[model samples]
Target: QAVVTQESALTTSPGGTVILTCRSSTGAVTTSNYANWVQKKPDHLFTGLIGGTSNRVSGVPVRFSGSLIGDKAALTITGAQTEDDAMYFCALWFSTHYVFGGGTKVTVLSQPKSSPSVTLFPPSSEELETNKATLVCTITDFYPGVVTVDWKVDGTPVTQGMETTQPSKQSNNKYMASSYLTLTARAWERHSSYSCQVTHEGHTVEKSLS
Candidate 1:
């Protein structure tokens, strides 16, 4: 298996430049892997910035560039704006699957407040009959859109069967995202506590059902 890694977080002042890197565990990351870089802006809109080592995608700004730095693939952003405060992800196309880095949260210092409003929507009764239940966590109005979602049942953290969407831009200049957790109805019936925890910047927001 190809494992990918990236810096957990990064911070820079406005107009500063930053480099984000992605590495493969097996060996040096090469052009054959089709190394790609993606930018997840505050609004959760994912933009493919670069592909195939250093090829910048169409419509990508000239300020963004890519290259091979040592044995890893690197993305460089120059003259970053406060709007550039977001998350970045790198991907490698392997034989049968696409491996992605853990993601890097990039922050542009001195940005304004744009905290998220989160909501949890429970599964419908009809869904229970299928032996599976889907719980949706809706996050909206967030800015600087780097957020992490986690799940817990009856206070125990859940690690599987969860899907989180990338933050997307909203009309009012904020961001929105949704996370889904699927569980067996039997397990849901036996539990009284289900929670969705979202973390952004240094703050955490949670919604729960009891």
Candidate 2:
């Protein structure tokens, strides 16, 4: 397997310059690899930004360019804007196979950073007592919606049965996501408290159920 990698994330001021690089584990990147770049938006949409190593996709903005910057392939975003905050992916074609990088998340600063509003809810009381159940953590109304979710039982962290969704744009132009923590029947009632913790833009917020 020719593992591909990219920077997990990047941040840039509005109108600033940013470069996302992709590398191959098997060999140094080259034009012959036919490096491709793509931009991903909400609603599971992706736009091809570059192809054939450095050719810009038709109608793609000029601010975006692709090139081999040393040993890796890079997608350069010049004069970035708020709308450019998104996920970028890169792919390289070898003679016999295709490889893709783990996408990079680009964050463009938003003025007066908005903190996510969190609402955590446990399963109905009856469900908690008799059947496997789930707790819900709803995070909403945040700008730059990239965030992390953590769960705890009685103040101690736990990871089993946790599933978190990626942030999706809301109709109001904000962002939202959900996290579910499941527990076995009767297991949930043993701890009077369960906590839903969210980390966003360096801040952590916690909501508990008792």
Candidate 3:
């Protein structure tokens, strides 16, 4: 059960060079793995840029290339363009199946970085396991799309029962995402405070419901 690893996010100025590497959890990655690179855009848009042979897909941009760099499979983007600002995923073929790395979010930084707006909505409803309920957290108007969401209850951190949406581009070119927290219905009516903290480009925007 070997796992694949990849950079979670990357940023570079316009026309800058970027190299993304992927490695196998078991050991060094090699050409035998036949690394594949795929690009993801907003709204279900996916483009296969490279296949296992380190060859570019039929019409991938010239700036895109793949190679075996030391122990890892690497994707190089030379002279990055704004349009290249999307997620890149790598898949390693292991004969029986494909082990995909956690995708890397590539940002060209063609425009100024904008902070995110955070908002939290208290619990409403959900699964009926002993009167369960859910809380909602939303982040909007963010640029570059690399962000993290943290949840807290009564001053302590929590992760269980929390689900978040992947950041997606909006009409204004900004990105938005949402997170949901679930707990027992009685807990929402109790004395605990709920918080949502979203970090975007060094700024952490926080919101809460009590």
Candidate 4:
């Protein structure tokens, strides 16, 4: 039995897009198999870029899309935002367990006339809780500067803080920055309505907790 392989990737420029993929030898990328694309903004909310791996979430623009690439499942996010300065993740079911990739980071740069291209190791706390209650948010691979990430209880912001002056780097020559925000009953009562608002480049891009 081949262990399911999940991937998360990104692009650097504003108009650039990144494709994250999930591969399994167990079967073709079918309706029964599950896949999803998640984005974390500066505000600390985890937004669904692609859900069920192929369907777009309620308000997500037409820029995001999903499909099966050859034998692998693929996810694409277009019209990248400045707060896109986070990691992307992929998921799949395997042997009654879930699998994930190392995660890919997308850093924002001055929008080039053409385009530009581009995470972190797992920590104790996880962020994606709908399925596993694990909430893991990565801000890895960022340059030296003031960085902070906050959470929203219900479309509002949370003062929860992270002040990392510089990010860590990997053997692959990539920088890493990440944090996790645990939730409580007050949060569940609202039902994934919370959002993560990232503040950078003098703008904000929020991803709903749902």
Candidate 5:
């Protein structure tokens, strides 16, 4: 089995440099393995950063670079920007099989740590007549825009009937996102407690309703 490993997370200040590494468990990483690097921005958009051993993709900033360091592949960012704060993933092609690193969360420290303001809205009474209730979780004013959201019902984690939107850029450079959870109206009126958990930069905020 080919297992890829990366640092769980890293922190750097704006204008500083950070290097993220991807290593393999089965064997030494080489150019023949075709290591590639991808960046997942706060908006949830994936961008190809490095295609081969050290070839950077077009439109990628020069400050974003990659190379092979010893038996591992590396991605380096010079003069990191707050917008550059994102998750970096490395993929390797071995034989005919492909594998990916667990991803490295890169945080660029900036001024005024902006925490997301979360709000939960329940369905209106008139909509309950349709046998469905929609739970809306709105997140606003978050910087960097990256966040993970989860739903829980009566203390149980929920995974179905949920949809989360991509982060949208606000005019003020902040970000916003909305998540929706659909449930049966009967279940909603049962006084079941529902919770929305939002995580960002190692901090978690939650909103709940019964």
Candidate 6:
């Protein structure tokens, strides 16, 4: 499968509207595989975009809308908030894994600038077994682009996983959350290291979960 990517920019007037988009490297984003979205706030946290086939996460304001435009998965923000000036991202489940599109950075210049860098949940290199573990990475502020998640076992890729998303509370139009990568810990060697590598915006980071 091709890596998912989003356009770098789209400008809107204050109190206007804008649609940040996520496009798949392969083809159209279908209902069976619509792209997901993620947003980062000034506070520096990553939130989910769209998930569960268009179900919004808890507390997400209705101003955020997601859809397929041409060959891309698009996120439209209405009644744009000053707090919405932050980074945005898109994602989708491919095969048995999850991949993120590059992020869209919103700059509401009138509002104070937020922090930088997305946060990592479970920190880095946390250990756990398969049974329903969640993998999270967040960016409080970001420039739109492509982000990817690689679930590896001692350096090899895993064959089963699910990718979903949600919104963040740092501000309106901003989102952050994680992808749940289900695993079968008992199926592997005890004490083994399973790592999750999230790549985006020309940089990369990794976490090892046992």
- Alpha-carbon lDDT, every model: 0.87, 0.87, 0.85, 0.56, 0.88, 0.62
**TM per candidate:** 0.59, 0.88, 0.76, 0.47, 0.68, 0.50
What TM-score does structure 5 among the candidates reach? Answer: 0.68
Tens digits of per-residue lDDT, candidate 3, 1-210, equal 989999998989989999999989878788888899999976657999999748889977899999999999999999999889888999998879999889998977866778888878766444445597788898888887768998988888887878989887788887899998887777777747788899887878899867
**Best candidate, lDDT-wise?**
5
Better of 3 and 4 by lDDT: 3
Q: Which candidate is the best by TM-score?
A: 2
Question: Tens digit of lDDT per residue, candidate 1, span 1-210?
Answer: 879999999988899999999999989988888888888865367989898979999997777999999888999999988777777899998878889999999888654768889999988989999999889899998876679999987768899889999887678766789999988988778788898999987799999986
- Report residue 29 deviation for candidate 6 (angstroms): 1.4
Task: Single out the weakest 10-residue window by summed lDDT for candidate 6.
Answer: 123-132
Tens-digit per-residue lDDT, 180-208, candidate 6: 55544344444366676666545666656
Point out the worst 10-residue segment of candidate 4 by lDDT.
114-123
Question: Which lDDT tens digits does candidate 2 get at residues 47-139?
Answer: 999999899999987899988989999888899998898889999998898887889999888565789999988787777556788888999
Model 1, CA-based lDDT: 0.87
Segments in model 3 whose C-alpha atoms lie over 4 Å from true places: 25-33, 93-99, 123-134
Prediction 6 global C-alpha lDDT:
0.62
Better of 3 and 4 by TM-score: 3
Residue 134's lDDT within candidate 6 is 48
lDDT of 2 at 129: 56
lDDT tens digits, residues 1-210, model 5?
878999998988898989899899987889987889998976478989999868889998889888888888888898899788788999999898889999998978665668999999989888799999888899999976679999987768899888999888778777799999988888788857789999997999999977
Q: Indicate whether candidate 3 or candidate 5 has the larger TM-score.
A: 3
Clashes of each: 5, 0, 0, 19, 0, 31
